[PDB]
């Protein structure tokens, strides 16, 4: 009767592991709000800030943008959507992301688990090249893609391992057809009481 603070699920995975694809299904069936940090950042550069050409340069190189930009974008959207729960997609991608979250957000959300989509690099590469045929994204090319893998491997995997220490990671294998992946996703969110 006091208002419940939002539930948050972090959705992580390599580049092109299918986070956005599966998050759209969850929005559809469960009515959570999907916040893709990458989308939000592409939005922020596309009208036409301050930070816009930094974001462009870092995205093209597969680098993680300074967390004050990204966490502000997440927090604004969350604050605009009282009484919803949130799929925070592609964040946190390093320890700075995670610390800046805890600093800003921690008393105001119940962050529940990390949903991790596990996929082979070689499969991700093929998806991302295919996507790049029509996505118009500056990072869907062989150069950027391999830079994105290194950033994932070096920075992001440590974050997932950190959450896994506290038993807060749910792993779904993502090297199958999208409906087979989603069947498991839908079953998980049902089992978690959502
Ligand atoms: N299970 C899957 N099998 C094959 N293609 C997939 C699968 N999941 C997503 N895709 C495709 O791979 C690409 C990357 O998926 P996307 O969800 O955008 O990735 P990300 O994890 O970067 O958000 C898209 O073109 C998407 O349609
Ligand atoms: N937490 C995040 C999420 C995305 N990004 C940037 O946006 C790019 C695209 O991310 P997505 O694949 O999640 O859309 C990343 O490779 C990275 O350069 C970021 O800097 N910080
Ligand atoms: F999360 Al992506 F390409 F959109 F890695
Ligand atoms: Mg995405």
Reply yes or no: is the peptide bond before residue 92 cis, omega within 30 of 0: yes
Ligand 4 center–CA 190 separation, angstroms: 23
Q: 87: which residues sit within 8 A by CB, 6+ positions away?
A: 8, 9, 11, 23, 26, 27, 32, 33, 34, 35
The closest ligand to the CA of 71 turns out to be 2
For the chain, report the end-to-end CA distance as a whole number of angstroms: 20
The CATH number that domain 1-194 falls under is 3.40.50.300
CA-to-CA separations, 49 to 52, 70, 137, in angstroms, rounded: 5, 13, 19
The residues, ordered by sequence, that sit 6+ positions from 100 with a Cβ below 8 Å of its Cβ are: 67, 68, 70, 71
Quick one: which of 89, 88, 42 has its CA closest to 69? 42
Gap between the Cα atoms of 176 and 194, Å rounded = 24
Place of tokens 């998806």: 127
Phi, psi of 83 (to 5 degrees): 80, 10
Whether the CB of 14 sits within 6 Å of ligand 1: no
Are 26 and 185 a contacting pair, CB within 8 Å?
A: yes
**Structural resolution in Å:** 1.7
Neighbours of ion ligand 4 (CB under 5 A): 20
Q: Is 83 left (phi over 0), alpha (psi -120 to 50) or beta?
A: left
DSSP helix/strand/coil, 95: helix
117 is in an annotated binding site: no
Query: Alpha carbon of 14 to those of 31, 72, 106, 139, 194: distances in Å?
Result: 25, 23, 25, 14, 25
Residue nearest to atom 24 of ligand 1 (CA): 131
Does residue 18 have its Cβ closer than 6 Å to ligand 3?
no
């Amino acid at each position: 009767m006091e208002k419940s603070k939002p539930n948050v699920v972090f959705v992580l995975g390599g580049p092109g592991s299918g986070k956005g694809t599966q998050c759209a299904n969850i929005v559809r069936d469960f009515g959570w709000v999907h916040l893709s940090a990458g989308d939000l950042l592409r939005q922020e550069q596309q009208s036409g800030s301050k930070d816009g050409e930094m974001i462009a340069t870092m995205i093209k190189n597969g680098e993680i943008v300074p967390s004050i930009v990204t966490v502000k974008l997440l927090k604004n959207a969350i604050d605009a959507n009282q009484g919803k729960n949130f799929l925070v997609d592609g964040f946190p991608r390093n320890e700075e992301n995670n610390n800046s979250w805890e600093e800003n957000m921690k008393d105001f959300v119940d962050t529940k688990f990390v949903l991790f989509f596990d996929c082979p690099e070689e499969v991700m590469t093929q998806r991302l090249l295919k996507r790049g045929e029509s996505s118009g994204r500056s990072d869907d090319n062989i150069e950027s893609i391999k830079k994105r893998f290194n950033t994932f491997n070096v920075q992001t995997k440590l974050v997932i391992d950190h959450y896994n220490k506290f038993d807060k990671v749910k792993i779904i294998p993502a090297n199958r057809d999208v409906n087979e992946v989603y069947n498991d996703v839908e079953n998980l969110f049902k089992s978690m009481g959502f």
